[PDB]
Amino acid sequence: VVNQNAQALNTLVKQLSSNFGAISSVLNDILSRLDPPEAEVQIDRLIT
Amino acid sequence: FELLHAPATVCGPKKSTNLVKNKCVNFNFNGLTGTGVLTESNKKFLPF
């Protein structure tokens, strides 16, 4: 049970580095390099 | 001066800042941007 909880936490942290179809996984890069009218769709892909 | 949807690697000088330790700050180390506290560490980094 300790391993399962740790693995679920580790996967959840690992999913932060998943793009989910966005141009980049890190939110700061996609916000900095793209204007908000276009960056909104990429930020939405990461948020969803 | 070309700005694509890509990393901007031709930069005007921007390195004149002083590091502060043990305080929650927004840091930018040669293109790595993050928020947190900076502390002296005993990690033996390899030269590269």
Contact call for B5 and A34, based on CB within 8 A: yes
The C-alpha atoms of residue A36 and residue B48 are separated, in whole angstroms, by: 36
Resolution in A: 4.9
Q: How far apart are the first and last CA of chain B?
A: 31
- Of B4, B5, B28, which to mutate for an interface test with A (greatest number of A Cβ within 10 Å)? B5
For residue A45, count CB atoms less than 10 angstroms from its CB and return exposed for 0-12, middle for 13-18, buried for 19 or more.
Answer: middle
Q: Within 13 A of A45's CA, how many CA atoms are on the CB side?
A: 15
Which helix H or strand E contains B32, and what residues bound it? Answer: strand B32-37
Token output for A16: 């932060």
Task: Tell me the C-alpha distance between A28 and B33, whole Å.
Answer: 8
Amino acid sitting at position B43: K
Calculate the alpha carbon distances from A40 to A15, A22, B31 in Å. Answer: 20, 11, 23
Place of tokens 């001066």: B1
Q: How far is the C-alpha of B9 from the C-alpha of A22, rounded, in Å?
A: 22
Residues of B in contact with A28 (CB under 8 A): 33
What is the length of chain B? 48
| Residue pointed to by tokens 């949807």 | B5
Q: Which H or E run contains A47?
A: helix A36-47
